[PDB]
């Protein structure tokens, strides 16, 4: 309905068409732009979804029209994309998983259960860091007022 | 407790508490009754040579069980 | 590999040796510590508290 | 007499009754349900072939289109069993489907067509299920498992009144098809029938006879009985139907009979069936409570005094009279016998004529529109007898048809009136008690869906799937060079079937841990899943054992626990239906012999008869020999004579399935301890060397056998050359088929990793020379001892306290059996390190890696990867891969610290593959897979070249063998007709395709067999091309990976304090200590028991068994130490024929006898060989030893019979008093090692989302402290354990981190604060709009 | 939400004494309220798609 | 040693045809199958318990 | 954090529901947003209205409305109500059940040489325990300088 308004403030009846022909026109632009806009949690570009599109509809022809299978190199020779501009196409995911995703039958743990935070401190490191902060400190006890302020602002 | 000796408690209980419940319905020791308590027939001594303290005949017994055979 | 139980206690956890597994915590503080060994220590809990 | 195989180790067999029918092959559901999913079936009415009929032809709008089918065809694989699993895809053939597309134009709608399109299609693939009945999946070895799932058809159930709490139960009656409406009766608490056509509202259950067109007094005419009253004021009477208390007495012939008062007795009924009565004058009261049962009017005016269906009221009566109306006609209402029912609920149904019975039909299915007279018409006629909405199967009526007991057992797929008034006549009776209700869990209304019935029907969901495609591809446009294959998708037809094997809980993984554990697995029959009830609905419904499940399902072996009885096993001779019911064998008892034309019986057909046990006694000619024989009708065993019996059992193991009938003394365990030790068998790990069970059951052979770890010989022969990897039988003239090269390989499945990561192997027990028969063992799988299933160990095993080392369930080793590592088992764990791509690079997989000093870097090689053969440790670099990083801003500190030694920072990470904490094993393979893209590295075409000389080398050691064999084979044509002998082998055998002879077929024959050696050397020449294709080709990797490298350790665990040893009959326990050889208790020979075992869980847990086992085992290895005494000595064989047949022939009336007098002498010392362990004790479930035959047997032997003998203890020296039993009981070592089960934290990874410490074993995980260990923290005064045990413990990332340094510093003291379970709850809240705050002191 | 535990089947013996009923009347009040007064209007639906 | 006496059903009801046998003999296919309806019904609610 | 967007292995992700139901209502303003900007019919604004309220009814409780909607997977989205509310919720199952730092498990034996007041731990189990107090210790003593 909102290209269904922008359609009528640019249809003209002059050229004496249907309107349920001009409208169509917007309605296919604009339900499939914003299913290309606002649909996936991971926003893709407009042309990149018809990146995706057109090798979801050619790589489905060569399922049959191949064989068993279309390999990804064999996608380099149908569409003129050079195995790379094809490889990053398949590499991007699909509105991917959710964290309630049921595991399961273990204690009904989900998988954001299992998902380990890595930017985290470990307590390892972090007395190890601690304690490299006065042993610095004690190393620095063995320099006079000078070189050791030096070296502790450069 | 090894998961198949509370299953022996269970089953146990199981065994006793219906064999109890029958065993209950026996009517052991009665009066001579000589007249059955719904028909007012004479009850047969054999019966209650089998059974003392039969306060309903057989068929009238057997009608009893027959409604009682749903419920209600 | 196995924790070695006291036999004793294996009426109060009522844990049998036919595979259980026994999950052992380490109380850090010395007020857990404590607690550990005036409260919860396996003999000065020797009476039901039922 | 034996096979040769069977002829080296004869298991001695007590078990007195005669074997009818063999076990057959167990794997026959699987094998045989696939046999009829992947066959083309020309009357098509099976599997992919019905499917195909059922969707296709294809219709357009119009009928301008129609696609039609030719034909299907499975191709072959791409890859074979082995390479799928190595590479990890499913063992698939891929579906083509030959296919025909017609047009048709104007006036020809099936005459005159325009244009066909034939074409072959690619729709989808489909699994294959592989020689042994299980899948690969993903490379994994998938089971896909049967359903119990509840058939279509008639089911009569009941409410148990606890529906109402004034008592009274409610029967009812569902009619479930196949797809169509449920039409449901019940009764009312006041006795009136209702109907509801899909679970809705209720409607009077005359509406249903109604609308069928019945009026009231065709209704009254079929649902009862009709006592007819006349003037004067006479009765006529039927003489059965008085029954209910004398109301009024009798009035005939004027006389006497019996009077008032008392009750109708069975004296009664007979003097007026003796004295002729037929007619009785009764009163005006007794007709007062009756029900008129047709119309009548008075015949001056035709005007209605009384219809049917009305009380009758006695002016009502003088009004047919002053009518002149002679005949009155009544319904027959006892409240016992023939209830009113049908009556009282016309009295309360509102409406009386078609035209509005359709109306209260068409407002319960479509409420609120005004009902047409055809359009509510047009939908109850379409709705119960259109075979487009209500389908009835054929088991659909199988079942329909034999509830109601007729003989139709074939008919329509919908109802009729009279199939519709035959429900209600039965759930009528189900009130009135003529016949019982049905059961939930009758085997009889609980049909098996197998594999090849749920592939179908997740095919045929699937051709629905793509026929929406193609009925609207079809008619838009209808253009030609339109082909069959731009229409048809493979992919909605392939996301309905690698969904179904690929995630579906009806297809799980295959317990492989023991040919047991997977021959169970097989044959298991789940009631979960998909059409069936989940653990929810489940009861206290199914989960109990029902008399029906005898021959069937086994009553013993089911998993105990979550669900128990929802899972079962099928039993030994169990059989499917051809409608899908289990049908077990029952040999025919004629007149009063016992006939051999087996019959197998579903559990419908088993309560009509009179069925024996086979536990009773019979004569050598087939007769019964006691006169009251014990049989079991229908509920019920009781004591019927020899000739009214129709059915015997065909032998006692016929009530268990394979998993409990290897249990010896099963008869003396507890049913639940024999569930018990069925379920700990399968759960068994294969031993270093495998062992027999010295007392077996005798079905050992058989399950060994008949699943597949073993390499069974397919035809007979000589062993050409025997390896540790393959077997070559050259075969016999006999079974050679003349155009074959003469030898079949066996290739054996050397040390390969199972399902549960234990180690599958396979080893030659045949040797050079020896002969072999067809079906006859040559090499042994896992877990298995010649052919004859081998689960554990013989173990000296003895009852007695000792020390509290076996207190509650415990056991108490020797360190004699850790000394001869008879539970010691090989554990092959792969772990594998997966070079990706990631942003800023992706992953090297160097040797040169970070600043780990390059003492664990020399197990590497020169890519990164450590050789076959290594022994790792813990923590031992397996693939040394490095990831790319930035810089990542170093600290002060650090500044300082890397200006001084200047080492930069190295820029790069250190993920690599490491082996996890505590196993030690060897390295056994590496494989590297890699992206075609990416080129290798030196390991990876190390690898490869190796692979490609294998793989190159076996198909020339193929043909130059096959030649070996063909060269011997054409050989033996030169004898004969133009014989070239002593120039044969003179002449060079490659002119031996110029070898002249008599031009007969033989020489044609000749020009053949040599000829097919050229097509050995072409299909040589053409498979090594295939060989170079898939080892060379790149890897289908899932996409961002490039370098997948599955390094193979193995482990070999050995026993411990803490692993888990159990019996078979359901005596397990935790091994507690491993006691030292010296310490153990021994006899006056010096032999130490190898295990002590507690007696106090045998009076209790009542399974008698392990210690009847125990003096079988006594027994056994009292035989086995005189025949390894005597060759001990080397006597001759005068003393050992003498003694071994004495040995084979033991106990009363065995049906085993094996004659050693017809025996070779070199056959007799290879017994004696096999013997000199002990000999094998078979005992048949039911059947087998009775406790004299043991004392006889241990009499044989110089033991005492009692079983017990005196024992001194080990560590000083004086005899425990009360002699002790000791024995050979069959121990088991479970898979629960405390190798997998020990587990320790101090600080490892934690969970991002809260901040929690990680979860399991492998991702170095904490403990669950939940709410019941927090209330029992609680209820001491621990409070400051329990705060750091929500806090500093779990949580709180600030004050674990500051618990960590106070640690290290000495400083036991927490300051813990706030969780951080805490704040993202006050964010949650505070995320809706709730102002939940923290308040200020 | 009562909840008078509306499931499927006959339900078992114990779980009418195990499943509690929380909580009495308020909740109840309201919906009596409610469950007395939508007998009357037929059109009752929230849904933005039917609406 | 004793008889093991009459065996219950998960009906409540109890099997009439009792067990007139024991674990020191042995039980034969009929008895057999008749326990197991008492200890499936025992361990079911033991392990539902 | 408390509804992240984690990279897992091979380029996939796996979010939590709730960026659903706030992608849902960021996309509801904003198209209300533009249609009170147009001064649209009323009609087509009153459903977008209605649209909008409905997502913040399926964003704060996915289910008290009806329907609870589901995404591409066939269970409901959990919501901040299911997020606080529930046996797997935070009140119930990480305000009490949580796991626990310093903890192991093994097997239970016996071992009757034991008095009443000792269990026998092993010793890679105690190894893995006391680490940080074995630190501590064991540089106390000074056997090790540095903590590495
Ligand atoms: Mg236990
Ligand atoms: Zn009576």
């Known amino acids: 309905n909102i290209g269904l308004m922008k359609a009528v403030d640019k249809f003209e009846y002059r050229r004496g068409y249907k309107f349920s022909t001009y409208a169509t026109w917007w309605i296919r632009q604009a339900i499939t732009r914003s299913i290309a806009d606002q649909a996936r949690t991971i926003r893709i570009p407009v042309h990149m979804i018809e990146t995706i599109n057109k090798l979801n509809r050619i790589s489905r022809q060569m399922l049959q029209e191949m064989g068993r299978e279309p390999t990804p190199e064999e996608l380099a020779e149908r569409m003129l994309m050079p195995e790379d501009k094809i490889r990053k196409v398949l590499k991007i995911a699909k509105e991917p998983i959710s964290m309630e995703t049921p595991i399961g039958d273990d204690e009904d743990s989900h998988l954001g259960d299992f998902i380990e935070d890595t930017t985290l401190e470990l307590p390892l490191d972090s007395a190890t860091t601690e304690s490299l902060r006065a042993a610095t400190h004690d190393v620095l006890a063995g320099l006079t007022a000078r070189e050791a302020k030096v070296l502790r602002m450069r | 407790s090894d998961e198949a000796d509370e299953a022996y408690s269970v089953t146990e209980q199981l065994t006793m508490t219906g064999i109890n419940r029958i065993r209950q319905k026996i009517n052991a020791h009665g009066i001579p009754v000589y007249l059955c308590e719904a028909c007012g027939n004479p009850i047969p001594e054999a019966r209650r040579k089998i059974f003392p303290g039969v306060t309903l005949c057989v068929e009238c017994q057997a009608y009893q069980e027959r409604q009682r055979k749903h419920y209600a | 590999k196995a924790i070695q139980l006291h036999p004793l206690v294996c009426a109060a956890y009522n844990a049998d040796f036919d595979g259980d597994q026994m999950a052992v915590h380490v109380p850090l503080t010395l007020e857990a510590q404590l607690e550990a060994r005036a409260l919860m220590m396996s003999t000065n809990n020797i009476l039901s508290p039922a | ?1337 | 939400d009562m909840g008078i535990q509306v499931m499927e089947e006959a339900p078992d013996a114990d779980d009418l004494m195990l499943a509690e009923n929380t909580a009495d009347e308020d909740a109840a009040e309201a919906a009596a309220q409610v469950l007395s007064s939508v007998e009357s209007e037929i059109g009752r639906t929230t849904d933005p798609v039917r609406m | 040693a004793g008889m093991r006496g009459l065996m219950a059903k998960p009906d409540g009801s109890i099997i009439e045809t009792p067990i007139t046998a024991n674990f020191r003999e042995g039980l034969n296919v009929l008895q057999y199958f008749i326990s197991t309806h008492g200890a499936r019904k025992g361990l079911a609610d033991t392990a539902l318990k | 954090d408390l509804r992240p967007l984690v990279p897992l292995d091979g380029g996939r992700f796996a979010t939590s529901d709730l960026n659903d139901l706030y992608r849902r209502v960021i996309n509801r303003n904003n198209r209300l947003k533009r249609l009170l900007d147009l001064a649209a019919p009323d009609i087509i604004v009153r459903n977008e209205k209605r649209m909008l309220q409905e997502a913040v009814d399926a964003l704060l409780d996915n289910g008290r409305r009806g329907r609870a909607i589901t995404g591409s997977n066939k269970r409901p989205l959990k919501s901040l109500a299911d997020m606080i509310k529930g046996k797997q919720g935070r009140f119930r199952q990480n305000l009490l059940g949580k796991r626990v730092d310093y903890s192991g498990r093994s097997v239970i034996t016996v071992g009757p040489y034991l008095r009443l007041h000792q269990c026998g731990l092993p010793k890679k189990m105690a190894l893995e325990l006391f680490k940080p107090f074995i630190y501590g210790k064991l540089e106390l003593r000074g056997l090790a300088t540095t903590i590495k």
């Not at chain 4, 009261?285 to 035709?302: N, Q, R």
């Not at chain 4, 969901?461 to 253009?479: I, M, N, P, Q, Y």
């Not at chain 4, 044959?523 to 609905?537: N, Q, V, W």
């Not at chain 4, 079991?632 to 059915?647: H, I, N």
């Open chain 4, 1 to 1337: 007499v034996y096979s040769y195989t069977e002829k080296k180790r004869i298991r001695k067999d007590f078990g007195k009754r005669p074997q009818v029918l063999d076990v057959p092959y167990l794997l026959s559901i699987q094998l045989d349900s696939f046999q009829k999913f992947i066959e083309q079936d020309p009357e098509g009415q099976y599997g992919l072939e019905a499917a195909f009929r059922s969707v296709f032809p294809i219709q357009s709008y119009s009928g301008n289109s129609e696609l039609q089918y030719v034909s299907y065809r499975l191709g072959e694989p791409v890859f074979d069993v082995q390479e799928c699993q190595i590479r990890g895809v499913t063992y698939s053939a891929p579906l083509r489907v030959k296919l025909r597309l017609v047009i048709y134009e104007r006036e020809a709608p099936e005459g005159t067509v325009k244009d066909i399109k034939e074409q072959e299609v690619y729709m989808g693939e489909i699994p294959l299920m592989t020689d042994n009945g299980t899948f690969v999946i993903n490379g994994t070895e998938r089971v896909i498992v049967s359903q119990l799932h509840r058939s279509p058809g008639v089911f009569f159930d009941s409410d148990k009144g606890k529906t109402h709490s004034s008592g009274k139960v409610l029967y009812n009656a569902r009619i479930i098809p196949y797809r169509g409406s449920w039409l449901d009766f019940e009764f009312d608490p006041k006795d009136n029938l209702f109907v509801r056509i899909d679970r809705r509202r209720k409607l009077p259950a005359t509406i249903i006879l109604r609308a069928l067109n019945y009026t009231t007094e065709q209704i009254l005419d079929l649902f009862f009985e009709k006592v007819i009253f006349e003037i004067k004021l006479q009765m006529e009477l039927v003489p059965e139907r008085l029954r209910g208390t004398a109301s009024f007495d009798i009035e005939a012939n004027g006389k006497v009979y019996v009077e008032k008062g008392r009750r109708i007795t069975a004296r009664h009924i007979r003097q007026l069936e003796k004295d002729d009565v037929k007619l009785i004058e009764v009163p005006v009261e007794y007709i007062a409570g009756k029900v008129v049962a047709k119309d009548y009017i008075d015949e001056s005016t035709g005007e209605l005094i009384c219809a049917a269906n009305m009380e009758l009221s006695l002016d009502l009566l003088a009004k047919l009279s002053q009518s002149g109306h002679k005949r009155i006609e009544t319904l027959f209402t006892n409240d016992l016998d023939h209830g009113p029912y049908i009556s009282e609920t016309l009295r309360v149904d509102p409406t009386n004529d078609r035209l509005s019975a359709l109306v209260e039909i068409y407002r319960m299915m479509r409420p609120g529109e005004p009902p047409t007279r055809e359009a509510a018409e047009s939908l109850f006629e379409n709705l119960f007898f259109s075979e487009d909405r209500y389908d009835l199967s054929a088991v659909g009526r199988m079942k329909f048809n034999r509830s109601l007991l007729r003989e139709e057992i074939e008919g329509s797929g919908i109802l009729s009136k009279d199939d519709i008034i035959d429900v209600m006549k039965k759930l009528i009776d189900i009130r009135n008690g003529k016949g019982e209700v049905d059961d939930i869990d009758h085997l009889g209304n609980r049909r098996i869906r197998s594999v090849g019935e749920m592939a179908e029907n997740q095919f045929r969901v699937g051709l629905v799937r793509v026929e929406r495609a193609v009925k609207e591809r079809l008619s838009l446009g209808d253009l030609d060079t339109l082909m069959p294959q731009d229409m048809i998708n493979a992919k909605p037809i392939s996301a309905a079937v690698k969904e179904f094997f690929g995630s579906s809980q009806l297809s799980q993984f295959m317990d492989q841990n023991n040919p047991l554990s997977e021959i169970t697995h097989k044959r298991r029959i789940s009631a979960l899943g998909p059409g069936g009830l989940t653990r929810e609905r489940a009861g206290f419904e199914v989960r109990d054992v029902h008399p029906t499940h005898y021959g069937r399902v086994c009553p013993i072996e089911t998993p105990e626990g979550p669900n128990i009885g929802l899972i079962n096993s099928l039993s030994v001779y169990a059989q499917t239906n051809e409608y899908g019911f289990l049908e077990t064998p029952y040999r025919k008892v004629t007149d009063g012999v016992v006939t051999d034309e087996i019959h197998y019986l579903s559990a419908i057909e088993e309560g009509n008869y009179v069925i024996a046990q086979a536990n009773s006694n019979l004569d050598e000619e087939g007769h019964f020999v006691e006169d009251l024989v014990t049989c079991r009708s229908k509920g019920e065993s009781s004591l019927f004579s020899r000739d009214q019996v129709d059915y015997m059992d065909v032998s006692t193991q016929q009530v268990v399935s394979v998993g409990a009938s290897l249990i010896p003394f099963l008869e003396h365990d507890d049913a639940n301890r024999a569930l018990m030790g069925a379920n700990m068998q399968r759960q068994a790990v294969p031993t270093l060397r495998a062992d027999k069970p010295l007392v077996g059951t005798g079905m050992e052979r058989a399950v060994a056998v008949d699943s597949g770890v073993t390499a069974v010989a397919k035809r007979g022969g000589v062993v050409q050359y025997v390896d540790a990897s393959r077997i070559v039988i050259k075969v016999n003239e006999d079974e050679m088929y003349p155009g074959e090269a003469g030898i079949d390989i066996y290739n054996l499945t050397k040390y390969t990793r199972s399902n549960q990561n234990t180690c599958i192997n396979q080893m030659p027990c045949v040797s050079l020379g020896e002969p072999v028969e067809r079906g006859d063992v040559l090499a042994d799988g896992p877990s298995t001892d010649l052919g004859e299933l081998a689960l554990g160990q013989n173990m000296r095993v003895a009852f007695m306290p000792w020390n509290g080392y076996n207190f509650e369930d415990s056991i108490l080793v020797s360190e004699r059996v850790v000394q001869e590592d008879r539970f010691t088992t090989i554990h092959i764990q792969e772990l594998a390190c997966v070079s990706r791509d990631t942003k800023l690079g992706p992953e090297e997989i160097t040797a040169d890696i970070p600043n780990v000093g390059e003492a664990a870097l020399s197990k590497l090689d020169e890519s990164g990867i450590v050789y076959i053969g290594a022994e790792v440790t813990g923590g031992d670099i397996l693939v040394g891969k490095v990831t790319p990083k930035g810089e990542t801003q170093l600290t002060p500190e650090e500044k300082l610290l890397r200006a001084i030694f200047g080492e930069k920072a190295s820029d790069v990470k250190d993920s690599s593959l490491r082996v996890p904490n505590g196993v030690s094993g060897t390295v056994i393979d590496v494989q590297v897979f890699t992206r075609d893209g990416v080129e290798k590295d030196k390991r990876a075409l190390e690898i490869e070249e190796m692979q490609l000389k294998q793989a190159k080398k076996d198909l020339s050691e193929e043909l130059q063998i096959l030649e070996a064999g063909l060269f011997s084979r054409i050989r033996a044509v030169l004898v004969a007709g133009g014989v070239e002998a002593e120039k044969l082998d003179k002449l060079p055998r490659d002119r031996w395709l110029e070898l002249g002879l008599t031009d007969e077929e033989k020489q044609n024959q000749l020009e053949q067999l040599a000829e097919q050696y050229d097509e050995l050397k072409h299909e040589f020449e053409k498979k090594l091309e295939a060989k170079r294709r898939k080892i060379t080709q790149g890897d289908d990797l899932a996409p961002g990976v490039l370098k997948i490298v599955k390094v193979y350790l193995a482990v070999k665990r050995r026993i411990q304090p803490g692993d888990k040893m159990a019996g078979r009959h359901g005596n397990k326990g935790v091994i507690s200590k491993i006691n030292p050889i010296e310490d153990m208790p021994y006899d006056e020979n010096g032999t130490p028991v190898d295990i002590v075992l507690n007696p106090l869980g045998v009076p209790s847990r009542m399974n008698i068994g392990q210690i009847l086992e125990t003096h079988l085992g006594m027994a056994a290895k009292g035989i086995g130490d005189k025949i390894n005494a005597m060759l001990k000595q080397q006597q001759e064989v005068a003393k050992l024929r003498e003694f071994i047949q004495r040995a084979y022939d033991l106990g009363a009336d065995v049906r085993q006898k094996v004659d050693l007098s017809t025996f070779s002498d070199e056959e007799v010392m290879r017994l004696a060989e096999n013997l000199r362990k002990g000999m094998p004790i078979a005992t048949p479930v039911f059947d087998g030893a009775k406790e004299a035959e043991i004392k006889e047997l241990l009499k044989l032997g110089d033991l005492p019979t009692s079983g017990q003998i005196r024992l001194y203890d080990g560590r000083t020296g004086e005899q425990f008093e009360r002699p002790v039993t000791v024995g050979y009981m069959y121990m088991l070592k479970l898979n629960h090692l405390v190798d997998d089960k020990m587990h320790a934290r101090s600080t490892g990874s934690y969970s991002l989302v809260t901040q929690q410490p990680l979860g399991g074993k492998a991702q170095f995980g904490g403990q669950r402290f939940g709410e019941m260990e927090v209330w029992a923290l609680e209820a001491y005064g621990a409070a400051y354990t329990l705060q750091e045990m929500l806090t500093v413990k779990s949580d709180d990332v600030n004050g674990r981190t500051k618990m960590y340094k106070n640690i290290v510093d000495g400083n036991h003291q927490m300051e813990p604060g706030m969780p951080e379970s805490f704040n993202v709850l006050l964010k949650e809240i505070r995320s809706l709009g709730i102002n939940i705050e923290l308040e200020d002191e």
